Design a protein around this ligand. Structure first.
Ligand SMILES: O=c1ccn([C@@H]2O[C@H](COP(=O)(O)OP(=O)(O)O)[C@@H](O)[C@H]2O)c(=O)[nH]1
Length: 493
């Protein structure tokens, strides 16, 4: 009788970390016979294709559903009609009646009225996608978006050529939702659900009503909000029996901040912990800190579910140090380069393998060139199989400054690869036992980190013992059975 609704703004094939957490939590909750589906709030004309792709990938469990605010009212309109809205298509054909086609490409074409010479429409076709832009006195006023020759969206433009209004059409061509867009920022204003006849102030108000409609108000209906920006959608509902939980996936203090400010969305989630069933944080250190920083007590520590794959058959004897992450500023790959330079200066043999892609990639590539670390530091690009890459490492490293837990570090430990990491807020101290299953470095101490890398990289006996103890610890501390027990304990409170 228990059912779970997991909130996040959107799902997409590129996304990772928070979605991957939600995807596995769903798999685990479904395995424990508690359906755990995902609720999204954005609009995408191709959501069916995206969900099919995430499932084929093996990323999203087949059992996992995605409820979407738009998709829900879309299927209500689909059942509401049997015949297509031929009147909209005819209205479009009549606009391009006395035209003459002038191409630019295969799909790309411009249409002009042969009796006036006025620019009327721009049409761009791309296999499944088609966009029709309509003009008045040489300026774009409208846009009809198509998938498989069926209209799904109409956008209204202003004098400055920004979208000021949107309409969403069902599979038969019927407008089910319409809304105002504030030109300057792109904020969702006044909304109209045509399928139900109802009207809302903004997207917040719509999604609040939608959650009140999707989720039955009973003790067995559980709302878990992962997306920090979409916490007000869960928070503001009228539900009086249904459970309300917030998951914080990051460190709550602002990144690269010396003022000591908190992340705004997280600050709000936190402040309102007593007013809901609870707020989940990944590590005990985060919870303790939150309790001393805020006048709130309803904070719970539940590590994210951990996937314990079998360990590599063989340990790596070769002096290979691994780093698998998104190439982003918080990861501090600049500090890993500064450490690599210190490591390679004392030992020529050691090699650094850095997997991933992102914003810092070019700044780090040029950094290897300056420090003449070409023969020892390798940017290997993105990996679809980090588990396989891990087999090839003697140890794993983390220069990251900010984390909620640090899943790559946990992943490395599962694959019997010890971690040498900066002792940051939050995560490394939760799972690394210094001088037993890896090393905890004083944050920014590039020299002490370099030392422990050299010690572990040149000791085949220490590397295998730290690796084997790293795996045993993840199994002991983050067992699926213990994590599910913590969640259940809250659901049954
Ligand atoms: O080239 C890459 C880069 C990253 N990852 C994965 O990205 C995740 C990173 O987890 P972590 O918590 O350390 O950092 P986040 O990406 O959430 O900031 C892990 O699952 C990695 O295996 C991957 O598959 N290939």
């Amino acid at each position: 009788m228990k059912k779970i609704f997991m909130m996040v703004h959107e799902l997409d094939v590129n996304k990772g970390g928070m979605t991957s957490s939600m995807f596995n939590r769903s798999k685990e909750f479904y395995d424990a016979d508690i359906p755990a589906d995902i609720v999204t709030f954005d609009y995408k004309g191709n959501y069916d294709e995206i969900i099919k792709a995430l499932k084929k990938q093996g990323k999203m469990d087949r059992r996992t559903k995605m409820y979407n605010v738009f998709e829900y009212f879309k299927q209500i309109s689909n059942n509401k009609h049997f015949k297509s809205n031929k009147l909209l298509y005819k209205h479009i054909s009549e606009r391009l009646k006395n035209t003459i086609e002038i191409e630019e490409s295969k799909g790309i074409s411009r249409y002009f009225d042969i009796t006036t010479r006025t620019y009327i429409a721009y049409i761009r076709k791309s296999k499944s996608e088609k966009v029709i832009d309509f003009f008045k006195d040489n300026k774009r006023i409208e846009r009809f978006s198509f998938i498989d020759n069926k209209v799904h969206m109409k956008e209204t433009f202003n004098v400055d050529n920004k979208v000021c209004y949107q309409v969403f059409y069902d599979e038969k061509g019927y407008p089910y939702i319409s809304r105002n867009i504030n030109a300057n920022n792109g904020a969702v204003g006044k909304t109209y659900v045509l399928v139900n006849k109802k009207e809302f102030k903004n997207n917040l108000a719509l999604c609040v009503y939608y959650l009140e409609k999707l989720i039955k108000d009973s003790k067995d209906s559980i709302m878990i909000c992962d997306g920090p920006g979409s916490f007000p959608k869960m928070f503001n509902t009228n539900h009086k029996n249904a459970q309300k939980y917030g998951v914080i996936h990051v460190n709550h203090h602002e990144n690269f901040d010396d003022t000591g400010a908190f992340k705004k969305s997280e600050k709000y989630i936190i402040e309102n912990a007593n007013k809901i069933n609870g707020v989940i944080v990944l590590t005990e250190a985060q919870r303790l800190d939150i309790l001393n920083q805020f006048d709130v007590e309803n904070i719970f520590t539940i590590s994210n579910f951990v996937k314990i794959h079998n360990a590599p058959k063989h340990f790596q004897t070769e002096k290979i140090v691994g780093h698998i992450s998104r190439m982003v500023p918080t990861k501090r790959i600049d500090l890993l380069i500064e450490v690599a330079e210190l490591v390679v200066k004392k030992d020529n043999a050691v090699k650094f393998h850095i997997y991933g892609e992102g914003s810092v990639k070019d700044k780090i590539a040029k950094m290897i060139e300056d420090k003449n670390l070409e023969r020892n530091v390798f940017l290997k690009g993105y990996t679809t199989t980090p588990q396989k890459c891990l087999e090839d490492f003697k140890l794993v490293v983390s220069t990251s400054q900010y984390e909620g837990q640090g899943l790559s570090m946990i992943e490395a430990m599962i694959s019997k690869r010890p971690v040498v990491a900066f002792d940051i807020k939050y995560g490394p101290s939760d799972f690394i036992e210094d001088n037993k299953n890896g090393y905890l470095i004083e944050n920014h101490n590039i020299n002490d980190m370099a030392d422990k890398i050299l010690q572990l990289v040149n000791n085949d006996v220490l590397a295998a013992e730290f690796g084997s103890k790293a795996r045993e610890n993840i199994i002991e501390k983050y067992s699926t059975e213990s994590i599910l027990e913590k969640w259940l304990n809250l659901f049954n409170s």
